[PDB]
Design a protein around this ligand. Structure first.
Ligand SMILES: NC(=O)c1ccc[n+]([C@@H]2O[C@H](COP(=O)([O-])OP(=O)(O)OC[C@H]3O[C@@H](n4cnc5c(N)ncnc54)[C@H](O)[C@@H]3O)[C@@H](O)[C@H]2O)c1
Ligand SMILES: NC(=O)c1ccc[n+]([C@@H]2O[C@H](COP(=O)([O-])OP(=O)(O)OC[C@H]3O[C@@H](n4cnc5c(N)ncnc54)[C@H](O)[C@@H]3O)[C@@H](O)[C@H]2O)c1
Ligand SMILES: [Zn+2]
Ligand SMILES: [Zn+2]
Lengths: 253, 249
C-alpha cells in the first residue's frame, strides 16, 4: 500500500463496483503520470513479467467495464486483473463491520479488513464452485440454462455449500439439476472466475444411472450429444469448454 | 426455519464458534429433553433418517469446539461443522458491510439480505490446500510453530484471490519450505470448520530445491522414510488421510 509517484509503472487496475477502467478496450500499461494517477493511493496486488500490477480504488468517467473484455490476455495477467476487481469489491463490502456496525479499516500486512471497535476481521470471499462434464459412452450431457438465455449448450455447475465436499457438491448438483447419478468422478483443474468471485473446480464424471429430469429453474433443456455432433459451445478460455474438448478428444472410437 | 415443538433429532446449539456438548457429546433426542420447545431452529441436514437442527443459542455449561466430536462419523461431523459455521455466518452479518444498516436472513437460502442497499452475502468458505510432498521412498513432514505439540504433518495454506489450486500448492510449498514441486495429483477434499476452511488435498513430487523453512510458520521440516515416520496427526484428519495414502506406495 502506497501513494503513487511519477516514476511508478506497470499494469493499472482502476476498479470500482465490479468494473475496471479499460480505455481503448485495454488494460492500462505504463507510467503513472500517463494516467493522472500521481498522488493517488494504490495497492500492489502482484507482478507480471517484471511489472507491478496496481489496484487503484477509483471510478473513472468513461470506459469502465467488465474484466471479461481482457480475457484474451495471457491467463496469468487476466487472473491478476480479476484479483484487483475482486479486491476492490472486498473493501467496498466491509466499509462497516458485520458483527459490530462500526467502520472498518484495512490491514497493512495482508488483504484483510479489521474493526476499529470489535476484535473481528474479514478476508476476501472466494466462492468454491464445481463444474462437471458427464460422459455417457460416446456422448456428453449438455444443457441450456434458464438464467443465461444465450443458445449455448454447456456442462453443469453450481456453488459448493458449507459442510460439504467437492465430491458431494458434484453429486448433489448433478442430481438436483438433471436427475442422474454419476460415477468415476475425477478432478482435472481449477480456475479463478471473478464473476463476481468464484473458484471453479472442474471435474469429469461418467453416467451411472437415472433418466434426465430437469429442474426448469436452472435448465431449459438437457441431453446427450454424440461427441462429433455437438451444438454451440461456451467460448474458449473457460474451463467449461476445455472440459468439453477433453471429453470429446477422449472419444477412443 | 420456524419455532420448535415437542420435534426430534440431532441438536447443534451454537454460539460464538462453540456448540453445546453435554457429557462431551452431541445432544440427541426430543426437543423437550433439552429445554428447546418454543425456540427458533433451522434444519441444516439429515442423518440416518433424522433431522439435524441448528439453534442459535448460548448455554451456561459444556460449550465446546466441534473438534470434540470429530470421533463421529464423517457425515455427521460435517453437519455439526455446518451448524457452527452457519451460526457464525449469521452473527458476522448482523450489520451490512456496505451501508451499515441491519440485515435480516433469507427464507429461501442461507443468506443475509440488506433492505436498505439491496446487497447480500452468502456463507464464506475459505479454500485451502494441503499437500503431501513425496520424494521416492520419502515424504516431507514439518513441525508447526502454531500448535507446538510434537506432531509432524504436511503443509497447508489458504488459497489467494486470483490463483488456482495448483498455484496455491506451488506458492505455499515454496514460501514455507523453499522446494519446488511437480506432478500435482488431486486426491480428495474435506470441510474443516476451524473456522471455515475447505481443504483440497493434493499429492506432489519433489522436483528441486533445498529445505529452507519460514520460522514464522515452521519450526522444523525434513524428509522421512515411509516406514520410519514420527508422530503423525490423529487418524480421521485429512492430513492423516494424505500421509497414509503416500505411505501406501
Ligand atoms: N469458468 C467457467 O467455465 C464457468 C462456467 C459456468 C459458470 N461459471 C461460474 O460458476 C458460478 C455459478 O454458476 P451458476 O450459473 O450455477 O450460478 P449463477 O451464475 O446463476 O449465480 C447466481 C446465483 O448463485 C446462487 N448462490 C448460492 N451460493 C452462492 C454463493 N456463495 N455465491 C454466489 N451465489 C450463490 C445465488 O442464488 C445466485 O442467485 C458462477 O460464478 C459462474 O460464473 C464458470
Ligand atoms: N484438515 C486438516 O487436517 C488440516 C491440517 C492443517 C491445517 N488445516 C487448515 O488449514 C489452515 C492452515 O494453517 P494456518 O497457517 O492458516 O493457521 P491460522 O488459521 O491460525 O491462520 C490465520 C492467518 O492466515 C491467514 N488467514 C486466515 N484466514 C484466511 C483467509 N480466508 N484468507 C486468507 N488468509 C487467511 C491470516 O493471515 C491469519 O493471520 C489451518 O488454519 C486449518 O484451518 C487443516
Ligand atoms: Zn466490529
Ligand atoms: Zn446495505
Amino acid at each position: 500500500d502506497r501513494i503513487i509517484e511519477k516514476l511508478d509503472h506497470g499494469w493499472w487496475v482502476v476498479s470500482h463496483e465490479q468494473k475496471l477502467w479499460l480505455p481503448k478496450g485495454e488494460l492500462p500499461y505504463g507510467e503513472a503520470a500517463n494516467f493522472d494517477l500521481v498522488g493517488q493511493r494504490a495497492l500492489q496486488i502482484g507482478e507480471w513479467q517484471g511489472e507491478p500490477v496496481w489496484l487503484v480504488q477509483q471510478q473513472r468517467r468513461h470506459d469502465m467495464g467488465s474484466v471479461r473484455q481482457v480475457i484474451d490476455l495471457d491467463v496469468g495477467l487476466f487472473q491478476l486483473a480479476g484479483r484487483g476487481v475482486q479486491l476492490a469489491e472486498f473493501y467496498r463490502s466491509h466499509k462497516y463491520c458485520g458483527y459490530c456496525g462500526h467502520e472498518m479499516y484495512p490491514s497493512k500486512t495482508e488483504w484483510a479488513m479489521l474493526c476499529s471497535h470489535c476484535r473481528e476481521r474479514y478476508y476476501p470471499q472466494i466462492a468454491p464452485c464445481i463444474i462437471v462434464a458427464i460422459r455417457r459412452d460416446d456422448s456428453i450431457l449438455l444443457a441450456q440454462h434458464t438464467r443465461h438465455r444465450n443458445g449455448v449448450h454447456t456442462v453443469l455447475a453450481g456453488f459448493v455449500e458449507v459442510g460439504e465436499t467437492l465430491e458431494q457438491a458434484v453429486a448433489r448438483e448433478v442430481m438436483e439439476q438433471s436427475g442422474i447419478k454419476v460415477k468415476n468422478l475425477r478432478y482435472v483443474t481449477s480456475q479463478p472466475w471473478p464473476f463476481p468471485q468464484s473458484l471453479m473446480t472442474a471435474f469429469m464424471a461418467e453416467y451411472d444411472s437415472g433418466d434426465i429430469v430437469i429442474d426448469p429453474k436452472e435448465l431449459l433443456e438437457a441431453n446427450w450429444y454424440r461427441y462429433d455432433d455437438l451444438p454451440l459451445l461456451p467460448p474458449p478460455g473457460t474451463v467449461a469448454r476445455r472440459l468439453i474438448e477433453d471429453t470429446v478428444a477422449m472419444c477412443e472410437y
